[PDB]
Enzyme design. Sequence first.
Site, PDB file in Angstrom:
ATOM      1  CD  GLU A  69       7.433 -44.827  -8.154  1.00 54.73           C
ATOM      2  OE1 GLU A  69       6.535 -44.533  -8.969  1.00 54.73           O
ATOM      3  OE2 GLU A  69       8.187 -43.993  -7.638  1.00 54.73           O
ATOM      4  CD  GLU A 145       7.535 -39.984  -4.823  1.00 54.70           C
ATOM      5  OE1 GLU A 145       6.302 -40.172  -4.883  1.00 54.70           O
ATOM      6  OE2 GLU A 145       8.342 -40.397  -5.690  1.00 54.70           O
TER       7      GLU A 145
END
Lengths: 211, 211
Positions: A69, A145
Amino acid sequence: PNHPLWYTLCDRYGLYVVDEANIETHGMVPMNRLTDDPRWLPAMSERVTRMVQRDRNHPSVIIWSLGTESGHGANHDALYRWIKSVDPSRPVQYEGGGADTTATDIICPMYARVDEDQPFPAVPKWSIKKWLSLPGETRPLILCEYAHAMGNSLGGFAKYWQAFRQYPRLQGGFVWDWVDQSLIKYDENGNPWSAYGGDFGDTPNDRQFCM
Amino acid sequence: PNHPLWYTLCDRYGLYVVDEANIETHGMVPMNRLTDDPRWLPAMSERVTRMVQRDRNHPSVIIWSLGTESGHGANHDALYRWIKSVDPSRPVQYEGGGADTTATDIICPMYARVDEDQPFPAVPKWSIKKWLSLPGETRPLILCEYAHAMGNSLGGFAKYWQAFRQYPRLQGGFVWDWVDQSLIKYDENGNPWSAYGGDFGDTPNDRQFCM
Ligand code: NA
Ligand code: NA
Ligand code: NA
Ligand code: NA
């Protein structure tokens, strides 16, 4: 990077490890404000290079990650190449900037769905089956994820595994995540209870989203 | 190859045409018994070369086909290359030998399903979505035959079109087929009726499978 004993235990018990640099800038606007800035290249480089120098002899580590991120910035490209140059033995992955940038050997999306496209501007999450065959794409896909296990969850888990087994280049993924990040507090009687965001007076906080 | 007026009408009304050599050896055992035999190369070559010489100026013809259901023989490879060399302006396709051989620019399966694999030995029909992203595969997929419209049929037709629209490299297909091959016979009063295989005393025959 984890506690050093973690890798020794994965070596001995047998787990495949993605070793990941301590770099996340999620809260920046836009997400790559720092990672595209050459002024932040030295700080970023040390988080990547000092990780590789520490963990490169562990057999359990099969893949390096540039962090998470932090958008996609020029600093990621530089450090991706550094690893490729210094350790050709392991693929390098990184999900930021749409999971399939020039800074990743593996298409590594987060919460991309099996059959359903989520065509966000700039960073779409394609159906994983669709993503593999986009014009010119040849890389393996492994979700960094998926199947967000928050509370009463994992609905639709079997759909992922059916697709994993059917498509050679769909090679699995990493569930989010292993353990609830709850903390023990004690009531007036001294009895323990499980606490989450805000229970320590912490504000702003994101409540149960740590579990 | 069709009646020559067909191509003129397709040019003027506007239809994309796959022009196909008059070669099918379906009943051979194995299917490539003739097409792998250099003795049959002259006869096969004339069926390809004379089609190209005749039809190569029609704009409606966008793709050449080496024929159908003749397995995959060395003769196909020779003739694929002959076309590539003589007419670079049009892709060459051919389904025989598993729909994705070295004799085809386009993955062109017959009756491969949308989601369901049919893993036949040697010549499997993969789910079309799966087929696109097989390791190393890069070509477009256009079914040369799909949605077999026999009698009360075309169930699941919408499933193909959802997939065609979702996947860039799934670029459609050709329904099998346009028109019932029934023939007219007459009763004692001269009333016409629709006949199929066997109705002319023809035997062996495959009955209604012509419709
Ligand atoms: Na797989
Ligand atoms: Na969380
Ligand atoms: Na398409
Ligand atoms: Na038929």
